[PDB]
Amino acid sequence: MKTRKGIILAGGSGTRLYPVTMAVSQQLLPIYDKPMIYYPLSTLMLAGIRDILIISTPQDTPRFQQLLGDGSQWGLNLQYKVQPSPDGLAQAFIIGEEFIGHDDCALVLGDNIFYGHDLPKLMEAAVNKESGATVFAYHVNDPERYGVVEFDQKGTAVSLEEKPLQPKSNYAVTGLYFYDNSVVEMAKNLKPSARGELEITDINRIYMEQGRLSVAMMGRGYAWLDTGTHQSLIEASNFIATIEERQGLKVSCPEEIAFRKNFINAQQVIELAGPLSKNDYGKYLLKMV
Amino acid sequence: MKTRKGIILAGGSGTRLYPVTMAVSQQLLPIYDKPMIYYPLSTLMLAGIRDILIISTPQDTPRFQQLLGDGSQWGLNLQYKVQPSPDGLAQAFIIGEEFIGHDDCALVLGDNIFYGHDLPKLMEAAVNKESGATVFAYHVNDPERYGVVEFDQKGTAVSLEEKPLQPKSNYAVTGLYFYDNSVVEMAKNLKPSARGELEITDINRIYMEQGRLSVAMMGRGYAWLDTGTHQSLIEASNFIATIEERQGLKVSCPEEIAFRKNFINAQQVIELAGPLSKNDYGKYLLKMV
Amino acid sequence: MKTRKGIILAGGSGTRLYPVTMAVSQQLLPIYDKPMIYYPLSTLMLAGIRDILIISTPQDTPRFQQLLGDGSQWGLNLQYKVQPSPDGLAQAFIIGEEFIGHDDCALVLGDNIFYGHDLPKLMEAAVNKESGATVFAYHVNDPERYGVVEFDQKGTAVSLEEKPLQPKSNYAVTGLYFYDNSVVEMAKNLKPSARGELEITDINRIYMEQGRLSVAMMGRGYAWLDTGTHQSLIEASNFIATIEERQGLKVSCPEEIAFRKNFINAQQVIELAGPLSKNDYGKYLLKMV
Amino acid sequence: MKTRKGIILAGGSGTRLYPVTMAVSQQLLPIYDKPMIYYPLSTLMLAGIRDILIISTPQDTPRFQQLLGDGSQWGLNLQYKVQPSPDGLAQAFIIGEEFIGHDDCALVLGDNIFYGHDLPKLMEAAVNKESGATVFAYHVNDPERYGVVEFDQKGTAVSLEEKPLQPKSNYAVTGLYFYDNSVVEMAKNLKPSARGELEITDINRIYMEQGRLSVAMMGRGYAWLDTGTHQSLIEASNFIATIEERQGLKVSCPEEIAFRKNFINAQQVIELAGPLSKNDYGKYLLKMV
Ligand SMILES: O=c1ccn([C@@H]2O[C@H](COP(=O)(O)OP(=O)(O)O[C@H]3O[C@H](CO)[C@@H](O)[C@H](O)[C@H]3O)[C@@H](O)[C@H]2O)c(=O)[nH]1
Ligand SMILES: O=c1ccn([C@@H]2O[C@H](COP(=O)(O)OP(=O)(O)O[C@H]3O[C@H](CO)[C@@H](O)[C@H](O)[C@H]3O)[C@@H](O)[C@H]2O)c(=O)[nH]1
Ligand SMILES: O=c1ccn([C@@H]2O[C@H](COP(=O)(O)OP(=O)(O)O[C@H]3O[C@H](CO)[C@@H](O)[C@H](O)[C@H]3O)[C@@H](O)[C@H]2O)c(=O)[nH]1
Ligand SMILES: O=c1ccn([C@@H]2O[C@H](COP(=O)(O)OP(=O)(O)O[C@H]3O[C@H](CO)[C@@H](O)[C@H](O)[C@H]3O)[C@@H](O)[C@H]2O)c(=O)[nH]1
């Protein structure tokens, strides 16, 4: 089956970004012209996923609801669930067990921003994979900060380690994952790691050992914009601004993607444009159709 | 009397910045490494004002309270009051009548960012003025968007117009004002303009006609950053970021300002820095003391 | 035949960028960590093109030769020729007539900077096209400034205009072109335009009217960094720096491309690294092998 | 005597910046909208110095002369001299001995960028000093990279060390110095240091030991931009671009300075702005007068 459910994990207290995140959720922070979460949301929409569960903190979930509603305005079906404590990426599947049901599901971090050509085809295999899991590898300068995947000479991925002190490679596993239905029980069966979290890397290693993990390489022609510091956030906004102003197009605009993939029509677009017409956003949509 | 009370007017629905202000008050949005509200707050602190009333919309006032508390952590006394409808800048003095009492009071807009090494000195005269008012002029190339002050050959302020279609000068009257106690009665007597607002420019014209208006000039050593569009927000964040890292200092950091003006001591700075120490905002403070 | 010759047109006086370009040729200006010309040179190398003619002004041509030499150090064959006066892009084929001989040839502008995922594949049809020409269309905000290609409902390119006052579309024809051997005679018979230049757009319209022009779409996932203003130059440098620092990889590094495509071996790279080892460039190459 | 002569030391091979300095003199590289040399040149002009000697390498000197000419277009008198080998900053006084004659003279490095609203007043004292020397200190986080000046409790300069492994303070002695006529003979008596150069710090230590040294402090309102690496160059260009755009001015624009200090008149400004009018550098000047 094609993966048609997705979860955006957008919780966390954001201590690493204080004081900016003392009174605004990290995933609501603007990346130039739109909140951060519009980017990973766009990534799921580009993969054809329209049924999505958003997980956030007790305090932030209602702000995401206020921003997005049930998503029907974009031809989506959005649901929300609260994560009491940030216990690890894998907890997303426990919290989302009912939402997932017996289907396949993708997980994307609310702060995962991708930009690049052919992202839909980069994700196509993952979306259509019969069983197992797919993750994406990206070369970074500081592998120690991420889940790291090692490849042998044939170029086959043969190991995964979470924040290794001596990375076996410079390839980090990104915040976009595709899983089959077995991930739910797999997650419920995990024990906390040394840092007290249900590790996504433990989930991935299981799939790998059973030969069910596909590691899709995301080439250097793609940008995976970091959002870990005040500096990286402003560099992400400038990057997106440089692209949009030059092209006269927006990057990860849900309304545009919904329209282009026919989740909604021109008429619906014109309505959505109304409340946004005081700036380039609403005008952009009207000009579009 | 030295002006020792101040009001930060930080209401508004933020429609102009949608969708980034759909779930977030514009004044909580970050300008590089701190919430926008830290900027006008620092401006008042730099004038020696420690008793401050923050006004916002019903919905947003509690978020400002959660972010700032009563201000005692920085040696300030912050109180809060709500503005049900944005009836105009001058309504700040009606809502703040009880807070003001019989004292002089300054008003700063919550979305105004003032920068300038000599600003404290420039505000000194305004703080000490015995009666009347002081406003701050800044050269812009789009005067038609603001209150505009015209000067005669001698250099005396001769007229004030709110968004003149044919500006008489290129000097905008910025959102920082120091008034004597009579502004409250002036405000309570104003009638709404054509746009249905109690205008700050009408208040300023009254002081001008009584011969009690001083105009402080902010020359090219100053910056008054635009926060009106997605584009101006990133331009403002870029400005703060480049100046802080190239000049090795922090712009409008209340903890630093409170410490430097002795509102708080080194022990308190370290205590405040703890929760903020995962990034340079907190580490800078620890190094400072 | 596969296109195996290329021309980099890097002349012009650069008046648009004065006074920066009174002091340095535009194509020698740094785009973060390397001279601008390294970018279009990398593009040709990525297409497998190693036999290249560099055209510049009488004053600058020796500068490029000083920088690049004959390119043998990177397994290329670089030659130089002077363009007495900037009489138009098409003059490149007259100046390069002897160099081109009877072969196919690509033309890239010395200030053309592309960044994106599958560039080699995007150019593959062009490199292998039997006869005719191939150009690349990119969506921009200001088509008026470029050669514009209009598409009909079916998506077929139906017209080409050079800087139309009323663009028939928002697709600009970039500075990368692939031609068969017939372009030389077209160029020799072209009459100057209203502005007194031999227009590349007239050459392209000739191919188009013969039904021999392919228009390869460069999606919004690619960046075509503008280099026309002081502002666009720093946005380009920041864009590249953002990508490189995050990845720990360089964009358009000729030594790396030469090495990866086996134009040179590791031993060769070590020698090239020597004179560059005082900064990350030299160190990067050493680390690479 | 008022200091009326200045020397800009602009040699060196700039190997740390390869490959961008392979075919371009480092001081001809742009810092946003004008060549690097314009900055230290403006620093001298702001001190009222109009008789200037530019010293560079045998390959680069002619390029500066090509760009700047005799400086008469800006009411200056510029002359040039070649430094055969980079034997040290202090060699400037030997090479420039004939130029200096019996007068006082300032020395500024060709790659130092000084910014600050009060710099002119700050330099006024130095220009008027009857005898002795004035140097400029600036706080840095990496004092070990520069000449370092230590102050006692009183605030008196008590030691000077060139690149100390154990810095005695964090105040760097920047690349701007004002000397009386005794500096020439001091230079003739210097012996090369361990690194084989005539050190400016030995000269300054002599003045210090004779109790004839003044140290001007550049505090928070100043910026002293690093131009040593590819990264610092873009950081410096970002600083200039942001300050210029946000504050509506030009940093170190010789035409503007020449006009404002009455070195040239409005007609000459327009004439000079013509060739520069395709962009804002020229348009700003036209608007200025
Ligand atoms: O104790 C925790 C841990 C994470 N989070 C949140 O979950 C998201 C994950 O971010 P982060 O903690 O910085 O990622 P890491 O936990 O360091 O790494 C995970 O996410 C990386 C990027 O997606 C993967 O490379 C790693 O393999 C995976 O373990 C964020 O928005 C966090 O706020 C919390 O709230 N609390
Ligand atoms: O009743 C009100 C009116 C305004 N605001 C806020 O105040 C700021 C002011 O913005 P805006 O209303 O759009 O500015 P204008 O009212 O058009 O202009 C005012 O602010 C300018 C400087 O920013 C001055 O030059 C003008 O003279 C003055 O009238 C915003 O964040 C508003 O939301 C409130 O909170 N309540
Ligand atoms: O005789 C010439 C003409 C141009 N150039 C250089 O080529 C580049 C092109 O810039 P410019 O001359 O300003 O562009 P245009 O010639 O106005 O336009 C051309 O380049 C555009 C994309 O850059 C295309 O869209 C247009 O169709 C094509 O005609 C610059 O670095 C020029 O200096 C030369 O070296 N020699
Ligand atoms: O004989 C020489 C020596 C240097 N330079 C140039 O002068 C600048 C100085 O650069 P560099 O030699 O690398 O700096 P240092 O000599 O290490 O440091 C000097 O410059 C610093 C400020 O930039 C001061 O703090 C130090 O005290 C002073 O010794 C460069 O553009 C050089 O190419 C010359 O043109 N000729």
TrEMBL record, chains A, B, C, D:
<keyword id="KW-0808">Transferase</keyword>
<dbReference type="GO" id="GO:0008879">
    <property type="term" value="F:glucose-1-phosphate thymidylyltransferase activity"/>
</dbReference>
<dbReference type="Pfam" id="PF00483">
    <property type="entry name" value="NTP_transferase"/>
</dbReference>
<feature type="domain" description="Nucleotidyl transferase">
    <location>
        <begin position="5"/>
        <end position="241"/>
    </location>
</feature>
<dbReference type="InterPro" id="IPR005907">
    <property type="entry name" value="G1P_thy_trans_s"/>
</dbReference>
<dbReference type="InterPro" id="IPR005835">
    <property type="entry name" value="NTP_transferase_dom"/>
</dbReference>
<comment type="pathway">
    <text>Bacterial outer membrane biogenesis; LPS O-antigen biosynthesis.</text>
</comment>
<keyword id="KW-0460">Magnesium</keyword>
<keyword id="KW-0479">Metal-binding</keyword>
<comment type="pathway">
    <text>Carbohydrate biosynthesis; dTDP-L-rhamnose biosynthesis.</text>
</comment>
<protein>
    <recommendedName>
        <fullName>Glucose-1-phosphate thymidylyltransferase</fullName>
        <ecNumber>2.7.7.24</ecNumber>
    </recommendedName>
</protein>
<comment type="function">
    <text>Catalyzes the formation of dTDP-glucose, from dTTP and glucose 1-phosphate, as well as its pyrophosphorolysis.</text>
</comment>
<comment type="similarity">
    <text>Belongs to the glucose-1-phosphate thymidylyltransferase family.</text>
</comment>
<keyword id="KW-0548">Nucleotidyltransferase</keyword>
<dbReference type="InterPro" id="IPR029044">
    <property type="entry name" value="Nucleotide-diphossugar_trans"/>
</dbReference>
<dbReference type="GO" id="GO:0046872">
    <property type="term" value="F:metal ion binding"/>
</dbReference>
